[model samples]
Target: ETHRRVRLLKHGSDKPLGFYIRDGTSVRVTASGLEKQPGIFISRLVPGGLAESTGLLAVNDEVIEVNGIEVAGKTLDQVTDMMVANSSNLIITVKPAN
Candidate 1:
C-alpha cells in the first residue's frame, strides 16, 4: 500500500482549501473528475485553493485522522462533514500518494 502524507501546521486555514475534485460537492476526486467513494484522497488541486496557495496540503493525499479521530472506512461525505461540524480550526492528518 502507498503511504504518503501531508504535514499539519496551522488553523489559519480553518476552512477546507482548494483541493481538486471536478465535483468536490460530493466527496472524492480523481485526476480527471470528482465523485464520492470510501476513504479520503486528494484527487486534484487548484492553484488558487488553500493547499496550493499555502503549499500545505497536496493531491493524492489520504486522510488518516480528523480532530484525532481515525477516518479509515469513512466516506468523503462523512469526512467532509466532520470538517464541517468542527470549530473554525480543523486538524487533520494525511498520507500522500507516493
Candidate 2:
C-alpha cells in the first residue's frame, strides 16, 4: 500500500498570473497591475499534507533553496521543470506577505 500521499492545493477564486517555487512545491502566484499589488492569491499546497510535514515551509515563505540549490531570478517554467525532475514529494516554500 502507498503510505506517502501528496495533495496539491487548488487556486482559490483568484486567477494565476505567474508561477514560483515554495520549498519544493510549485505554486501559481497572482499578479496585479499598478493599481493593485502582487501576492500569493492562491497556492498548490494542501493543508496537513505530505509537503507540510517536511517542515521549514509555510504560506508566503519565499523559496530560496531547492534540493540544496538556490532558485533566485529563475523563471517559473524553469523552476517547475526542476521541481518535477527532482522529487515526487512536491514540497514548496512561499514568501511571507499579506
Candidate 3:
C-alpha cells in the first residue's frame, strides 16, 4: 500500500489547474519552521488540498501575499479569511525564503 501515485498539471497547459479555491485550504508545520516567528511560511503543505496538488508551490516557501494583499503581521486564521473573501475564488502568491 505504499505505491506512489502521480498527477501532473502544467502551469501554462490547457489543463485545468483548479486555481479557483474558496475554503478549507491550509498548510502544516515541518522541520523548516521556526526560521521566522510572528510571521508565517510554508514548511509543509496540507495533503490532498489545492496547494499540495498545485505543484507550483513547494516546502519552505514563504507566503508573503495573497491576491496581491500583504499578509504580514496577520495570523493564519486572518489570512485564510482574507484569501477566502466574499468571492468564492482564491489566489495565493508565494516567494522564496531567503
Candidate 4:
C-alpha cells in the first residue's frame, strides 16, 4: 500500500466531518509474519459529504495523520480533537488498504 495526502475544505457547511473513524490495532500478515499495529481506520463516509466529494479516501483506509500529526495509538477523542482544531482546511494522510 501507498500513502497519500488528501485535502478537505469544509466550506462552512457546519455539518459533521461526513465520515466516521475507528481506532484499533490492525492485524496484518506481512512477509515476515503477522503484525499488529495501532491504526485509525475510515469506517464510513456520509453520502454527499466532503469526504465523498474528495474521492481520494475510501472506507477501510488507514489514516496515518491529521494535518501533519501522527494518529497512531491515539484515542478517538484525541484524533477527533486534532481534526476539530484543524477544521475548515484539513490535510489527512492515509495508507490505502488495497
In TM-score terms, which candidate is top? 4
lDDT-better candidate, 3 vs 4? 4
What candidate 1 gets wrong by more than 4 Å, as runs, is: 1-16, 20-38
By summed lDDT, the worst window of 10 consecutive residues in model 1 runs over 20-29
| Every candidate's CA RMSD | 7.7, 12.7, 11.0, 2.3
lDDT of 1 by residue, 27-85 (tens): 54588787665566678876565567767567666676777888767766777777655
Task: For candidate 4, write residues 1-98 as lDDT tens digits.
Answer: 46899988887757767888988667766989999987789999999988898788899998889998999778998998889777788999988877
**After superposition, which runs of candidate 3 have C-alpha atoms over 4 Å from their true positions?**
1-37
Superposed model 4: Cα runs more than 4 Å off: 27-34
Stretches > 4 Å off in candidate 2: 1-44, 88-98
Q: How do all models score by TM-score? A: 0.59, 0.42, 0.49, 0.85
Against the true structure, candidate 1 reaches a TM-score of: 0.59
> Highest lDDT, which number?
4
Weakest ten-residue segment in model 4 by summed lDDT: 9-18
